[PDB]
C-alpha cells in the first residue's frame with residue numbers, strides 16, 4: 728500500500744549503479760573483434776564426440792566470458808559498500824556469482840526475435856548451437872534460454888536491472904563467506920532500494936509482484952550456476968582444453 732519516496736542515499740545508490748554499468752557494459756560490443764575468432768564446425772547432428780574433439784567455439788566464448796568476468800569485477804567494485812568488505816570476502820563473492828552475473832548482463836544482448844544473443848553481424852550472433860560447439864549440453868542450454876526469455880518478459884527498467892546484478896553479487900549465502908552479517912546488511916540496503924524503486928516508479932500491471940519475480944530469478948540462477956559448474960568440470964577433462972580457456976576462467980571455474 729504505502730509508497731515511500733526514494734531517499735537521497737537510495738537515489739545516489741541507483742545513480743552510482745547506473746554509471747558503473749554504463750562504464751563496464753559496451754552496448755556496441757566493439758571489443759569482441761579482439762577475441763580469438765569464432766569458428767563453427769559442421770555439427771548439424773549435435774554430435775558430442777565431434778563437439779568435444781573440436782570445441783571450435785570455445786576459444787571465442789571463453790574469451791568473451793573472461794572479458795565479461797573482468798567487467799563484472801569492475802562493476803562490483805563500484806557497488807556501494809562492496810569496498811567495505813574484506814578482500815577475501817570480495818573474491819569469494821565474485822568467484823561464486825561471476826557466471827550468474829554474466830547470464831544476467833547477457834540479457835541485454837539477448838533477443839526474442841530469434842532467441843539469440845546478438846552482438847553484431849552473423850559472426851557475433853550466438854545461438855544454442857554455438858554453446859554446444861563449446862562443449863555444453865541441452866541440460867544447461869535449454870533452461871538458460873528459458874531463463875533469458877523469462878527475464879526479458881519482466882521488462883525491467885535499467886535501474887532494476889543493475890540493482891538485480893548488484894544484489895546477486897552481494898549475497899550472504901555464498902559458501903566460504905567470512906562476514907555474512909556485513910554482506911547481508913549491504914544486500915538489504917540494495918534490496919530495500921529495489922523494492923522502494925519498484926513501488927514508486929514502476930507502472931502497472933508490470934509492477935505486480937515484480938519484486939517476487941525478480942527474487943525468483945536469483946533462485947533460478949543458482950540452479951543454472953550449479954549445472955554450468957558440473958558441465959565445466961566435464962569439459963575440463965578434454966585434453967588440451969586449458970589452452971582454449973584463459974587463466975581467469977580456469978581460476979573462477981576451476
Ligand SMILES: C=C1/C(=C\C=C2/CCC[C@@]3(C)[C@H]2CC[C@@H]3[C@]2(C)C[C@H](CC(C)(C)O)CO2)C[C@@H](O)C[C@@H]1O
Pocket residue numbers: 785788789791792795829830832833834835836837844846853858861863867955959976
Ligand atoms: C557474456 C556476455 C554475452 C552473452 C552471453 C552468452 C552468449 C554465448 C554463450 C554464454 C557465454 C551466454 C551466457 C552463458 C553462456 C555459456 C553457458 C557460458 C559458457 C562458458 C564456458 C565454456 C567457459 O563454460 C559458454 O556458454 C554478450 C554480451 O551481452 C556481454 C555479456 O557479458
